[PDB]
Amino acid sequence: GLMQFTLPVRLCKEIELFHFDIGPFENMWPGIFVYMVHRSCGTSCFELEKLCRFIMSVKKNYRRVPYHNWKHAVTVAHCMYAILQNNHTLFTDLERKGLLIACLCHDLDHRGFSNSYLQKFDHPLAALYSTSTMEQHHFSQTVSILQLEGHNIFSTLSSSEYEQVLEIIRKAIIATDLALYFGNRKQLEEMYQTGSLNLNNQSHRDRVIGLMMTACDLCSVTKLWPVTKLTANDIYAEFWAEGDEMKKLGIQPIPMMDRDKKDEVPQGQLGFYNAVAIPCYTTLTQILPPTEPLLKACRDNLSQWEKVIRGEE
Numbered sequence: 001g002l003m004q005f006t007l008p009v010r011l012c013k014e015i016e017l018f019h020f021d022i023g024p025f026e027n028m029w030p031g032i033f034v035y036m037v038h039r040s041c042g043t044s045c046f047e048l049e050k051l052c053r054f055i056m057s058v059k060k061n062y063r064r065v066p067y068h069n070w071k072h073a074v075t076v077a078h079c080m081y082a083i084l085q086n087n088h089t090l091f092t093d094l095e096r097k098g099l100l101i102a103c104l105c106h107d108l109d110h111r112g113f114s115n116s117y118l119q120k121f122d123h124p125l126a127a128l129y130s131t132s133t134m135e136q137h138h139f140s141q142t143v144s145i146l147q148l149e150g151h152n153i154f155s156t157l158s159s160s161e162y163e164q165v166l167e168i169i170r171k172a173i174i175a176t177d178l179a180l181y182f183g184n185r186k187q188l189e190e191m192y193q194t195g196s197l198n199l200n201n202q203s204h205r206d207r208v209i210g211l212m213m214t215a216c217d218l219c220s221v222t223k224l225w226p227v228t229k230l231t232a233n234d235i236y237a238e239f240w241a242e243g244d245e246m247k248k249l250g251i252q253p254i255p256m257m258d259r260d261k262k263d264e265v266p267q268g269q270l271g272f273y274n275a276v277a278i279p280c281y282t283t284l285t286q287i288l289p290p291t292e293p294l295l296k297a298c299r300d301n302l303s304q305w306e307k308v309i310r311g312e313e
Ligand SMILES: Cc1cc2nc(CCc3nc(N4CCCC4)n(C)n3)nn2c(CCc2nc(N3CCCC3)n(C)n2)n1
Pocket: 115, 177, 178, 179, 220, 221, 231, 232, 235, 255, 256, 257, 261, 262, 264, 265, 267, 268, 269, 271, 272
């Protein structure tokens, strides 16, 4: 009832910043999430006993893969927390409620393989979900966890508010399919420039929340250089494993997933920052000015990758 979550002074201060790293102590990650819901949504958005039971079932349904794990879930939720706190008045009570949960749930039961590998392996999930294969599975896993006894954190919502929050979370999670990002951003770019962009148009909010989701999902490129560099090692540990599995099926993997092309990583990051990250945070800064630190940090890390190529590190 009268039970605030607080963090040590360094975390209390640094959690408000976009570049915050949630640290290596796994047991504090749920406290960090609850702290962010309480400050973002209020201490009355969720029954605490249900929230905690939901957090812990979500954690149990993330796998011990090198990158798409529980640490990624909480990292992506913290970046969303940063966006919501810096754009307070632009978002509804339901969006605040829905989006932090969407972020925590957005990679539920990830196996460390691309939609691509599922489809070439002919995994059952590829027959059930022809596109956004894992992303439809992640939403499906969220609904399952919500339907466990004592886990419905949305129990107090109306029949209609419930359906609205589940629809926000579905679109939010689907948008983390980076194949849907390129089209989504180009459309947001055009609408912002021509002046058509209107935040009262529900299908416009959808695109903007979609871009936020991509921004939070890629936020590894917006961290302090040593965090950015070390997260890159984890990201390639998955991709190269998937490459290995591609070769087991008789398929040359793309360079991104070929451990034989280690040497080319720095150049691969350049391409990725220029084709994906920089455009993402550019369009997001334009639409939501207070997100500029993500763009600024992304540019700094690109510049650190340029230095890696030039032998300067
Ligand atoms: C820090 C960081 C974050 C990151 N996120 C992702 C997502 C990958 C992705 N998924 C999709 N889709 C989804 C369905 C179809 C399209 N797309 C479009 N992209 N890659 N990634 C990389 C590797 C970048 C890279 N590294 C090389 N190098 C090749 C040679 C050495 C490494 N390249 C090319 N790119 N580093």
